[PDB]
Design a protein around this nucleic acid. Structure first.
Ligand code: SAM
Lengths: 87, 95, 107, 383, 93, 75, 91, 98, 107, 93
DNA sequence: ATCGGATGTATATATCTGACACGTGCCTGGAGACTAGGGAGTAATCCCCTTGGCGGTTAAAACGCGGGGGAGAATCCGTACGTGCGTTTAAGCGGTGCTAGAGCTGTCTACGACCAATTGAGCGGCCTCGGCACCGGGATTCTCGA
DNA sequence: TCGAGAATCCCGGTGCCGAGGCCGCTCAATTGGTCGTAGACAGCTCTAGCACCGCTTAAACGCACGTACGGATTCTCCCCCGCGTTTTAACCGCCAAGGGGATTACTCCCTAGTCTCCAGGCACGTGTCAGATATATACATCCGAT
């Protein structure tokens, strides 16, 4: 603990039941034991891409707050337009 | 005791007919914050932005799992396995 | 003379004037035709009317008199053309339609 | 072993005296001058079944490009139709047994000598037949193949339109004044669906070369078949086609009813069209690419349409988002029962695929379909 | 500052099609975002069309062609019908 | 008795007489559904009913069907 | 005996069999396909037809807006770019 | 007997041959006729500038080749080497085209 | 007052002037900055240099001194970053990278 | 009339990088299309960025951000460094 | 496994050849030099919304234990797709001619930009009540092991 | 099939908070003018897309052998579902401070605009050599026999 609390891994925070529920919403009857780590990795990559884009928007705006419009524009850039948060 | 595959189908019906976020709010918020700590500046992450990130991530993973289930059914299997996800992301063009 | 909105002239609920100002201020071109904002407002109103009609049908079928994101999602995805138009779009708090593959159902 | 004509094809039942028996019995010598097939661009002469003094030359040669015109196929069709329609028994039997096997074998094997010999023997065998028996059979005819009038109209088309077909490509615009024909099969289908009959009136808005007008007047016996056209090239081709049709109809003894054309002038703001719309029983409008303004003008014209009048079109006359708020209570489109049907293959001349076509019947009362919001939809919604 | 949106017009169209149905704030925001997104799509397509033809004006023809290109199938036909009807009604005034 | 059809697909029943005029029918529709008179237009057999005329002028039959059009905006 | 028609235009026939079985075989072979089922040919003809109808419809719409009778290479390139199929070498 | 290669050897040979080549694997005239027929649906007569048909052929061949790559990946995922129409349908469904 | 091109000032081969004119006439914004075309021309020059460097390497691998579309395809698709940038792009007469799935090769 | 293109500058960059290597007309056209497409991508992204921040101008900052958003990974870093070098050299003289 | 036979194809050299590279006219777009407006930078202030914590509750996660149901491996069938060969089809080359549709140039007239005065549409704030969420209990429907 | 048993649906009552409607108050849309110029129409040019024909021969197509791989069956087995108990951390609710996101006001440097000058690059033309194509041969690879 120096000046800011460096967050721990927190990718295990996407728990096994959470990934199970996400699969169940997709119409998945059975899930392999290795699906959980694979889904964690895929989610990490996707979040890295989208958050990198959103932070690029924010730093261009000379802001230190990642506004919801930044996330919406980042997702619109990636062909994943999100409705319900403005645009 | 219900047989295997019964409660799984009940869960599929429960979560397909419902719209609440399936990832816990605070763990996903912490994950988003760490993913953004790669930039030295301490970001503030307007709460609607975290909610939008959770919406997009959940929708993306739901569509990915639909594709994974289609791949698994294509292979004469009902158990999705990491090669199914890899095939889905390859066919989509993400890998 | 008495002001009469162009939306009233075109029989449109959507704001023809605001659409014209958005086209001019959006820098889509150096000049914007007079009939272009009427056409665009009419198209937007028609698409909104279609989605709202289907969403209200969904809400009525669900015994609810208030459209929520779930009803919009059902309306969009149940209709092939609207789904194809909004194929790459995520609707927040929409969920996904009930669809269990026939292979997964019990034998 | 194949035949030029589908002998088992649909048979159209004649509902009026198609074959002018009085004209044939009163006139024995042909004086008209149809465009000879030889003049189009070894020869064989086909002898006219009814008029002894007329003989048509065909360039019978199985070495040219028959993509545009096939004189040998036409000769085979005419001999088969003589065997099928224009010849009484016992002559029909001998004409069928003697020529058709040899003629079909020659056509399949591209035997020019065999084909010419078949034509010559056919002419010799027709010449000895009394004309009295032939006209009597034409008097006693009550049905003929549906393909007969189709092939007859195509013969007239080849005499008239093929020599100047490229002139039809002078339309300048992409979404108006563009030329496209509807094949005679589709015309027979819609005329049967719309129940065209003797004494009815047929108008064709944008008749082009007048295929629909002449076909209606032939295979439906309309009291007046009308067609309006604007394009100058299509107008001149319509004049040529009608003259060729009159000559050919006189050649075969087929009566041609009153056919009228309003050429080189738009149907919009037209007096003749305006006064003829009230008495119309069928109105064919090829609005496949008519723009919205021309659709509105057609609506304005059709306001005066009568009850029972059926309007054939390639696209719906009413815009699919048509409603009734203020300026529709006195409008005709409210009373239009619109019925969609699917176009068959080879139904239109511009493509092979097909599509859809709408028949709009003018009802006594307002159409009940538009009131239900379900009809207004493009095509339940629950989890 | 005033944050403009299509809320009142979406509500008016809702009462036009469904007089006895309301719409929630989240659904209202989704509809507003949809209207903005489709407006941006059609306007950008018309801008590209005008640029390709070296034309400096977005006329009704450009928007009609953009609507034909964007919307699939019957949606394009009905939207073009609505746009042409609106332009015809507006020009005659 | 007669029936009237509205653009929303709702069938509404009216109890009137042949001597009844169009105006009283119009107010009858008003009081049962709240739609004011000036906004509503009546259609029968492809013919618009006139306020000065009456039902017997148009020869209404028993168990007939009329149509009601609501003035939303106009031109 | 064979009939004929041909009106004002040479109405092209189905002409999707012109995409022959060896052509689809070569296309699959370029894609790294070692073995091809017999039903791949009709399915691929259908897929190619659907794709070509979409692209040509967009290109002809672009031509319609330009008031032209000629589908230029730019029209095809813009139609493909609209679908995310951005094509280089033609403009 | 005559020298005959076992199944799959010449298939790999054609894979290697056509992967290092760039010429069009669909013949020019049949594809041009297909394009003209697909454009015959509109009543107008269209001209199809010669570069446009070539561009259509490039795009169609690239699309079909990518589709067959995806189909081969799907078939290999199913423990098979023979692509089948189910494989193409799965590839187009996952791609978002159906 | 000798004329010195802005590309010469920036040490770029690409046309800073034409880039500025295109940005002005492209309806991208009401106004275009003075340093913007220099930056965009520099980026375009760098990317073009990357494609041409890799394409020339591919051509030298084939013992050919002219860059053809095949060499551009090899350059783009053999580089992960460029392929990701041009993932949705088709290069005419480019072909495909030589690749065969492992299980398809003979045992 | 004149049809402008990036052919001469692509050739200059080629002779800068590979002095002994030519380029064919088809390859030159493909490189021209690549330059035009990347120009359109970067300019459109910069226009969107200017609109989002309610800015009427496209300065070097919007172009740099568009390059960061568009180019992946090391491409973005190298392009940004090259653009910064070009702008600094241009402003120095 | 290893040795020959047949095959494909890779390498090599010779001879074209038309597309690439370079030279030149010039003209149209780029560059230099004011001018003036306004968009953007910078400074000051408000207070919205963010961080952090904290404590209590309670749903959800994690751990552990059957067990049976689906994944994977091995075997066998047979048929359907690969490979050659001989025939047939028509693509491709290679000439010629038509003419009409794309492109460019020249009016000039309608149309949209711009600007100033006006005011009603539309948005920010605040009731306020009823449609929807929560909770208790009873009926319904499916699931599973006999 | 029947019974027992767990989700799930529904019925009613209660509660609440946010959608709907109302009230000001801006200020952006509307009206009314001119005025620059975009582009619709007309006329001319010209070149390229359509159409035709003939010949060569490369490629498609049909057929036959056969073999290997897709599909079905059967077996093991292990791993992942379902359920129960403990544990853990999300969640809600509430407090607090203050970071910085809006917002306004001022100045003033940057860029649109325009005018003139001029040279860089695009059309055209011509040289000539990289690449394609020809054959001919060496070498690598597949496959059958021992
Ligand atoms: C698609 S063709 C139909 C020809 C014919 N009716 C048939 O079906 O075979 C349409 C014809 O309508 C004509 N047309 C289009 N607009 C017209 C108008 N406003 N007034 C008169 N004729 C018109 C054109 O000359 C064109 O030949």
């Amino acid at each position: 603990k120096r000046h800011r609390k460096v967050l721990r891994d927190n990718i295990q925070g996407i728990t096994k039941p959470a990934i199970r529920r996400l699969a169940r919403r997709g119409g998945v009857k059975r899930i392999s034991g290795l699906i959980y780590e694979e889904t964690r990795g895929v989610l990490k990559v996707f979040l890295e891409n989208v958050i990198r884009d959103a932070v690029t928007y924010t730093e261009h705006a000379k802001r230190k707050t990642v506004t919801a419009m930044d996330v919406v524009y980042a997702l619109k850039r990636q062909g994943r337009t999100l409705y319900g948060f403005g645009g | 005791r219900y047989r295997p595959g019964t409660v799984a189908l009940r869960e599929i019906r429960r979560y397909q007919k419902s719209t609440e976020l399936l990832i816990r709010k605070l763990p996903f918020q912490r994950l988003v914050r760490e993913i953004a700590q790669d930039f030295m500046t301490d970001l503030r992450f307007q709460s609607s932005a975290v909610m939008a990130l959770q919406e997009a991530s959940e929708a993306y993973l739901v569509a990915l799992f639909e594709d994974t289930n289609l791949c698994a059914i294509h292979a004469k299997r009902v158990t999705i396995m990491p090669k199914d996800i890899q095939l889905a992301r390859r066919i989509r063009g993400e890998r | 003379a008495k002001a009469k909105t162009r939306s009233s002239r075109a029989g449109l609920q959507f704001p023809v004037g605001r659409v014209h100002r958005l086209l001019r201020k959006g820098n889509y071109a150096e000049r914007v035709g007079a009939g272009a904002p009427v056409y665009l407002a009419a198209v937007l109103e028609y698409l909104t009317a279609e989605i709202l009609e289907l969403a209200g049908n969904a809400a009525r079928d669900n015994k609810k008199t208030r459209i929520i994101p779930r009803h919009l999602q059902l309306a969009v995805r149940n209709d092939e053309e609207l789904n194809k138009l909004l194929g790459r779009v995520t609707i927040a708090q929409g969920g996904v339609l009930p669809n269990i593959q026939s292979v997964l159902l019990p034998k | 072993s194949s035949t030029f004509v589908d002998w088992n094809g649909p048979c159209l039942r004649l509902q009026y005296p198609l074959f002018d028996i009085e004209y044939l019995r009163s006139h024995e010598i042909y004086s008209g001058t149809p465009i000879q097939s030889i003049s189009l661009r070894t020869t064989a002469k086909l002898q006219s079944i009814l008029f002894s003094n007329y003989m048509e030359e065909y360039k019978v040669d199985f070495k040219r490009s028959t993509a545009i015109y096939n004189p040998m196929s036409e000769i085979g069709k005419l001999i088969e139709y003589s065997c099928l329609v224009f010849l009484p028994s016992p002559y029909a039997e001998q004409l069928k047994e003697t020529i058709l096997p040899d003629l079909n074998a020659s056509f399949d094997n591209s035997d020019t000598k065999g084909f010419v010999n078949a034509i010559n023997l056919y002419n010799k065998m027709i010449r000895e037949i009394p004309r009295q028996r032939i006209i009597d059979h034409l008097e006693t005819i009550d049905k003929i193949p549906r393909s007969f009038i189709h092939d007859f109209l195509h013969i007239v088309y080849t005499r008239s339109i093929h020599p100047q077909a490229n002139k039809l490509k002078h339309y300048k615009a992409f979404s108006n004044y563009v030329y496209g024909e509807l094949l005679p099969n589709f015309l027979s289908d819609v005329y049967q669906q719309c129940q065209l009959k003797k004494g009815d009136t047929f108008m064709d808005l944008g008749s082009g070369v007048g295929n629909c007008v002449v076909q209606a007047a032939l295979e439906c016996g309309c009291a007046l078949s009308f067609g309006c056209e604007i394009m100058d090239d299509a107008s001149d081709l319509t004049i040529l086609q009608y003259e060729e049709l009159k000559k050919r109809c006189k050649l075969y003894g087929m009566r041609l009813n009153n056919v009228e054309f309003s050429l080189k002038k738009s149907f919009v703001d037209n007096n003749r069209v305006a006064e003829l719309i009230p008495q119309c029983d069928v109105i064919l409008v090829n609005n496949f690419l008519f723009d919205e303004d021309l659709n509105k003008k057609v609506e304005k014209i059709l306001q005066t349409a009568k009850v029972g009048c059926k309007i054939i079109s390639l696209k719906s006359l009413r815009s699919l988002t048509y409603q009734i708020n203020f300026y529709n209570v006195e409008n005709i489109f409210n009373r239009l029962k619109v019925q969609r049907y699917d176009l068959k293959e080879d139904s239109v001349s511009w493509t092979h695929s097909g599509g859809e076509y709408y028949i709009s019947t003018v009802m006594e009362d307002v159409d009940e379909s538009l009131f239900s919001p379900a009809a207004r939809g493009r095509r339940p919604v629950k989890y | 500052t005033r944050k403009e949106s299509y809320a009142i017009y979406v509500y008016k169209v809702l009462k036009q099609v469904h007089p006895d149905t309301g719409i929630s704030s989240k659904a209202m925001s989704i509809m507003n975002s949809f209207v903005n997104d489709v407006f941006e799509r059609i306007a950008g397509e018309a801008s590209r069309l005008a640029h390709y033809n070296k034309r400096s004006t977005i006329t009704s023809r450009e928007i009609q062609t953009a609507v034909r290109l964007l919307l699939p199938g019957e949606l394009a036909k009905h939207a073009v019908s609505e746009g042409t009807k609106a332009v015809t009604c507006y020009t005659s005034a | 008795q007669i029936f009237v059809k509205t653009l929303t697909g709702k069938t509404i029943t009216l109890e009137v007489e042949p001597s009844d005029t169009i105006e009283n029918v119009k107010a009858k529709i008003q009081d049962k559904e709240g739609i004011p008179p000036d906004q509503q237009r009546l259609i029968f057999a492809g013919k618009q009913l006139e306020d000065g005329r009456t039902l017997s002028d148009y020869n209404i039959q028993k168990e007939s069907t009329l149509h009601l059009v609501l003035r939303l905006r106009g031109c």
